[PDB]
Design a protein. Structure first.
Length: 206
């Protein structure tokens, strides 16, 4: 009653797998903002009327979101923390692992519920990404690759774009990214903030 759904990871990272610096993201990318909001919020119209996507995030990532942007609107938010006592407010769900979050979600958004789970996204940070990359239901990575070795203090845990992982993770065609996201997506290099970046979708077989 717990693993009938794939997990998707969404991440922005450098070519050296850097993902963060000083509890924030060391870049200011307008399209990337638009894209993260769209991908995590989009529900295909063939999915049920009640459907909403889930964002799962680590406690440090939650604490990095400014209060005025919390919870992330139009998505079911879950914070993974081993601190049972931590008050999230607004009915935001708290869970002590990735699988505890999945069990809580299925228990809460059940047969009857006016809200039903659609896609489930892991949105960071580094420690939660490590658990997700180990999870047997993770099959899809929406990667924004940043073409500059911007100095970071936190790194992505598995080098999924590198030769060593290339028999498991495969980059899909841009039109398949656009099919899955349901909307035209900029194709190829985008240049803001002094360097190029681009959107990619990588998948693996479970
Ligand atoms: N580039 C990107 O796409 C993204 C980058 N980031 C960057 O990541 C950095 C933060 O990463 P990190 O410090 O790793 O923080 P996380 O957001 O992963 O938060 C870590 C805390 O979350 C909880 N936690 C995480 N994983 C688990 C687990 N598997 N089981 C139980 N609890 C877990 C623990 O909370 P507790 O201590 O309360 O028990 C842990 O101390 C920041 O720089 C941020 O800006 C964040 C999101 C996206
Ligand atoms: C953690 N985070 C974030 C932080 C905030 F303060 C926000 F208001 C927000 F919408 C997202 C964030 C931002 N952009 C991202 N982009 C990609 N591609 N992947 C992520 N997981 C991500 C997370």
């Amino acid at each position: 009653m717990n693993q009938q759904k794939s997990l998707t990871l969404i991440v922005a990272l450098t070519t050296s797998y850097g993902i963060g610096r000083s509890n924030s993201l060391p870049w200011k990318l307008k399209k990337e903002i638009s894209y993260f909001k769209r991908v995590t919020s989009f529900v295909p119209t063939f999915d049920s009327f009640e459907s909403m996507n889930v964002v799962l995030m680590g406690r440090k990532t939650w604490e990095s979101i400014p209060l005025q942007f919390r919870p992330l609107k139009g998505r079911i938010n879950v914070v993974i923390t081993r601190n049972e006592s931590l008050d999230l407010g607004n009915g935001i769900h708290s869970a002590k692992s990735l699988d505890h979050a999945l069990e809580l979600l299925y228990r809460t958004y059940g047969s009857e519920s006016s809200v039903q789970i659609n896609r489930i996204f892991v949105i960071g940070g580094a420690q939660l990404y490590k658990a997700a990359m180990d999870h047997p239901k993770l099959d899809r990575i929406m990667a924004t690759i940043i073409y500059k070795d911007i100095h970071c203090d936190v790194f992505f845990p598995l080098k999924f774009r590198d030769k060593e992982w290339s028999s498991v993770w495969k980059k899909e065609k841009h039109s398949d990214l656009e099919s899955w996201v349901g909307t035209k997506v900029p194709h190829g290099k985008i240049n803001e903030d002094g360097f190029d970046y681009e959107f990619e979708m990588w998948t693996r077989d479970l």
